[PDB]
Amino acid sequence: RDSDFPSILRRVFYRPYLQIFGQIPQEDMDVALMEHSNCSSEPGFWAHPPGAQAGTCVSQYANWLVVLLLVIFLLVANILLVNLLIA
């Protein structure tokens, strides 16, 4: 919900970049680790991420896909790209 332009750029580039160095904020992306609150007037279910620079309210519609994307991101970046660069 806090979709300012710097916030969008941060959550699109800076947070995934830090995930490559062991900085994985599960509480800001995994809805099962958040408290489910009615913080959005839009239809659907929402949860409150505790992070300061998170959106303070996120959708839980397909959060399993967010978790799967994190798994795939870690595989592709922390394992494949780094080892390829080593080679």
Add this chain to the structure above:
Amino acid sequence: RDSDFPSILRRVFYRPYLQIFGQIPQEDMDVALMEHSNCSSEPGFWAHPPGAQAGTCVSQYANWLVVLLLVIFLLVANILLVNLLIA
């Protein structure tokens, strides 16, 4: 503001050294993750880092450059130097 000589040496060498091993204290360097307080009599905007050995008050003038420097540091040290040593 807490610029003692051991504190300066710590924040200049020891903290960046630990960043190479996954110890990245974002709350002590990223002003967006701090609370903005009027803890300095000098002109400008200031924020309070929660870390014990941080300066308890830091400038937020060009904190985007601090974030960019962290990004570049991680790239140069955790990726380039380590893989070069492996080779």
